Every structure is written in C-alpha cells, then in structure tokens.
Design a protein around this ligand. Structure first.
Ligand SMILES: Cc1cc2nc3c(=O)[nH]c(=O)nc-3n(C[C@H](O)[C@H](O)[C@H](O)COP(=O)(O)OP(=O)(O)OC[C@H]3O[C@@H](n4cnc5c(N)ncnc54)[C@H](O)[C@@H]3O)c2cc1C
Ligand SMILES: Cc1cc2nc3c(=O)[nH]c(=O)nc-3n(C[C@H](O)[C@H](O)[C@H](O)COP(=O)(O)OP(=O)(O)OC[C@H]3O[C@@H](n4cnc5c(N)ncnc54)[C@H](O)[C@@H]3O)c2cc1C
Lengths: 105, 105
C-alpha cells in the first residue's frame, strides 16, 4: 500500500507535466503520438487493478489531443475520476497548466 | 526552476523503473512490441526539450531490451546510468534493480 501510493504519486506528477508540455498547436502526427502513448501508458501501468481500471477509463474518456490546454484539462479530469473512485478529494482543475511547471520553460 | 526539473525527473524515473520491473517474465510478441513502441514515445514526449532529444538518441544507441522484465529492468538501469554519466552523477549499482522497484502490488 505504501509503495503503491508512492508509485502513484510519482506517476501522476510525470503524467500531468507531460501533458502540460504538449504543443498548443500539435501536428497530426504529434496528436497521433499522444493518442498511442496514452493507450500504452494505461496498458503498461505497473499495477494490475490500476491498469484495468485506467484502460476502461480512457475508453470512456479518450485523451483530448487537439491542444496542450485540452490535453492538460483531460488529464486533470481523468485523475479526478480515479480520485472519485478512491473516495479522495476532487482536485480543482482551474489552474492545471500552471500547477505542473516543467522547469524547462 | 531547477528544482522543478529535478522533481519531475525523479518522479519520472520512479515511474519508469517500476513500469519495467512489472513487465512480464515471459512477454508475448505483442507485449514486447508494446513496450518497444512505448519507450520510443516516452522518449519523444518527455517534458524537457534538451532531455527528450538526448534520450531519443540514447534509446537509438541502446535499444530497449524486451525479452523479459529482467532484461527490461536491467536495460532501464543501464540507460538511466548513461544519463547519470552525462550529468556527471554517480553510477547506480544494477544488481538488485527488480527488487529496488517492486510495484508493492
Ligand atoms: C494511471 C494511474 C491509475 C491509478 N489507478 C488506481 C486504482 O485503480 N486503484 C488504487 O488504489 N490506486 C490507483 N492509482 C493510485 C492513486 O491514484 C494514487 O496515486 C495514490 O493512492 C496516492 O494518492 P495521493 O492521495 O497521494 O494523491 P495522488 O492521487 O497520487 O495525487 C498526486 C497529487 O497530485 C495532485 N492531484 C490530485 N488530483 C489531481 C488532478 N485531478 N489533476 C492534477 N493533479 C491532481 C495533488 O497535488 C496530489 O497530492 C493510480 C495511479 C495512476 C498514476
Ligand atoms: C528520460 C529522462 C531523461 C532525462 N534527461 C536529462 C538531461 O538530458 N539533462 C538534464 O539536466 N536532466 C535530465 N533528466 C533529469 C535527471 O535525470 C534527473 O532526474 C535529475 O537531475 C534529478 O537527479 P537526482 O540526482 O535527484 O536522481 P535521479 O537521476 O532523478 O534518480 C532518481 C533516483 O533513482 C535512483 N537511481 C539512480 N540511478 C539509477 C539507475 N541507473 N537505475 C535505477 N535507479 C537509479 C536513485 O535512488 C535516485 O535517487 C532526465 C530524466 C528522465 C526521466
């Protein structure tokens, strides 16, 4: 439970930062890459029950790849779906883009 | 700024090594291809421009080993050490790479 949670926190941090650095105006190939990436991300997540649940979640909520804004909002919303499932607080997605600076800007 | 980049990197590696350690001991051909495709996208989408370019070149030089989670995890330790080497950081002992990142699942 301890390790599972630590892996989870690290993964979300990476996840949200990745989406926040996606282009504002991606090319068709970049959109496809993000789409393919998310599918594999869900399938390979290092937790059986987590992966099963996430695969089902992205089927209901396909990643929005048209822009950095859409992608980041999508990420916050899907993370909140997991929060709902786990009886955790619902995160305010209002400043999602600013919450995950890459330190690369 | 610099702290952000470090925090994102630490989280990313934690996720990365745990994902590899959770890969099957005996993957199917399709699972091996999924990991191969995933790593390529992981490198291309990393949230830091210079880092992404550097890593893309690294995985081209050191292709991901997908025959088993043992081979994949060892490959992960080796490639992370190449980044350590480039950044003049200490080299991590890979002897217990699987146990180091148990999924706690
Ligand atoms: C893809 C994925 C699927 C998972 N599925 C499950 C599951 O099915 N079952 C299970 O037990 N565990 C699951 N986990 C684990 C779980 O989501 C948690 O990571 C873990 O329980 C630790 O919770 P936490 O309370 O520390 O915060 P986390 O949920 O790990 O949050 C990290 C932090 O990010 C912020 N945050 C919270 N919500 C959001 C949001 N909506 N958008 C942006 N930032 C947010 C907060 O600052 C918070 O402290 C999964 C993790 C991932 C990464
Ligand atoms: C794909 C990727 C590419 C990156 N490229 C660059 C880059 O080009 N330039 C730049 O400035 N930054 C880059 N970074 C960031 C950098 O690698 C570090 O994450 C960061 O500098 C913080 O370093 P750290 O000393 O805290 O430990 P990190 O290197 O983040 O290590 C995390 C921890 O994992 C363990 N660890 C160390 N080595 C290994 C290993 N070989 N195998 C398994 N576990 C290990 C240790 O317990 C350590 O504390 C990248 C990160 C990723 C994830």
């Amino acid at each position: 439970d301890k390790v599972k949670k630590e892996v989870g926190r690290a993964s979300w941090k990476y996840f949200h930062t990745l989406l926040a650095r996606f282009p504002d105006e991606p090319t068709p190939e970049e959109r496809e890459k993000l789409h393919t990436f998310i599918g594999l991300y869900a399938e390979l997540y290092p937790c059986g029950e987590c992966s099963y649940h996430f695969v089902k979640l992205i089927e209901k909520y396909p990643v929005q790849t048209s822009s950095r804004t859409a992608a980041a909002m999508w990420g916050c919303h899907i993370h909140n779906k997991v929060n709902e499932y786990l009886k955790k607080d619902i995160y305010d997605c209002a400043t999602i883009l600013e919450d995950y600076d890459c330190g690369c800007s």
